[PDB]
């Protein structure tokens, strides 16, 4: 599994022709000194590698979720 | 302090093998573990590998020598004999 950091790079990758499905994982965490925050992991399963994008902001995650191609099957965990 | 009066390097042999055999061993074993002057770089960094093989640590020059010294007296004499015969032959 390889990690992707740039969100723009991630959406173009999600429309690669070999991408079967995707996983959206929600992790409840805490900003150390701060308080609870909700991390979301977007995982795209390609032919060779699984690509993970970590989005610590719960709102840009929701926008990203509506920015993925509608054809991909998405499993919510 | 001085640890041994006379055995030196052969104190590793204890009392065995005979004093005559141990003191005769001491001369050649001091010679074979010494550092010699490199005729190439000038440092005292030439040490023995196997018998007849003498390497310099600094300039990494290896020279063929004697069993326990870099040069035997017989070889040094031959070099001068060869040097001598070379001068007359080449005028």
């Amino acid at each position: 599994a390889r990690e992707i950091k740039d969100i723009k790079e991630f959406v173009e990758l999600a429309r690669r022709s070999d991408i079967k499905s995707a996983i959206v994982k929600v992790n409840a965490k805490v900003n150390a000194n701060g308080k609870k925050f909700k991390q979301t992991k977007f995982k795209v399963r390609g032919s060779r590698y699984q690509y993970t994008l970590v989005v610590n902001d719960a709102s840009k995650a929701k926008k990203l979720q509506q920015s993925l191609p509608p054809t991909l099957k998405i499993t919510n965990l | 302090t001085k640890r041994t009066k006379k055995v030196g390097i052969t104190g590793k042999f204890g009392v065995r093998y005979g004093s005559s055999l141990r003191r005769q061993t001491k001369k050649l074993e001091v010679q074979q573990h010494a550092k010699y002057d490199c005729s190439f770089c000038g440092k005292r960094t030439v040490q023995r590998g196997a018998t007849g093989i003498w390497n310099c640590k600094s300039c990494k020059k290896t020279v063929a020598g004697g069993a326990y010294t870099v040069s035997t007296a017989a070889a040094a004499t031959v070099r001068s004999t060869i040097r001598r015969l070379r001068e007359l032959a080449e005028a």
Binding site: - | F13, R16, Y17, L21, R22, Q24, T25, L28, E29, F40, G49, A50, T51, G52, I53, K61, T62, V63, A64, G65, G66, A67, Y68, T69, S71, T72, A74, A75, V78, R79, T81, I82, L85, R86, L88, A89, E90
Partner: protein
């Protein structure tokens, strides 16, 4: 009786030489046009220890005169030869330590090693550490040279036969006592199975002509004829004399 230890060695079962660790056969170059008419130059890459040998060996790289390739030769290292030295071999090679010259090209008194018995056999005489061959004189009409060998024998060889200038390296090895059975064990671990040796007088009469007796003793003269047969030649074979060597020979 039984086959004695002399006779079991010819079959060579456990008496072959231990050669796994050997670094190649020490030979001169094959005598070619360049050595026969002029000289060729090579460079020393290595001077290495050869197991079972007191003399170190030198690996010398020459160019091949006829095809684009490097040829590595295994010479017997003469003392004073160093890594990176240029070695010159041939009729026109100069009188420097390590150069390979025909015997006729060396003046009287020249110390030479790895000498050819016959022209082109690539070295037969004076190959062990500290040993050498002295050139005593020349016979130009028949093209032959007289030399003195390490055993003290004088020999006449073709002047076209080659030799290496200098003394074989590693001499003085015998000056130090071994001091231990283990040292001889390690010495012969890479030579052959000839150590340790049981005295024939300590065997039974089946095992040896010296075996037997209610005391350990040979019983008959230990000088054996040259014309004796295998199984009898144990002791001093064709001995011209016995006893402490007194005076000059």
């Amino acid at each position: 009786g039984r086959v004695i230890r002399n006779q079991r060695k010819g079959a060579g079962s456990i008496f072959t030489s231990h050669t796994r660790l050997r670094k190649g056969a020490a030979k001169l170059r094959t005598l070619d046009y360049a050595e026969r008419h002029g000289y060729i130059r090579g460079v020393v890459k290595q001077i290495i220890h050869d197991p079972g040998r007191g003399a170190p060996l030198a690996k010398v790289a020459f160019r091949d005169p006829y095809k684009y390739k490097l040829r590595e030769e295994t010479f017997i290292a003469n003392e004073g030869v160093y890594t990176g030295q240029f070695i010159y071999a041939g009729k026109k090679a100069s009188l420097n330590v390590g150069n390979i010259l025909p015997l006729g090209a060396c003046p009287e008194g020249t110390i030479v090693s790895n000498v050819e018995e016959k022209v082109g056999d690539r070295g037969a005489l004076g190959r062990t550490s500290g040993n050498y061959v002295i050139i005593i004189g020349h016979n130009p009409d028949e093209n032959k040279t007289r030399v003195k060998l390490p055993s003290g024998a004088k020999k006449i060889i073709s002047s076209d036969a080659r030799g290496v200038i200098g003394v074989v390296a590693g001499g003085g090895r015998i000056d130090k006592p071994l001091l231990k059975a283990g040292r001889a064990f390690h010495k012969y671990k890479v030579k052959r199975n000839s150590w340790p040796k049981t005295r024939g007088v300590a065997m039974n009469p089946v095992d040896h002509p010296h075996g037997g007796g209610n005391h350990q003793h040979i019983g008959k003269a230990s000088t054996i004829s040259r014309g004796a047969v295998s199984g009898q030649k144990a002791g001093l074979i064709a001995a011209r004399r016995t006893g402490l060597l007194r005076g000059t020979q």
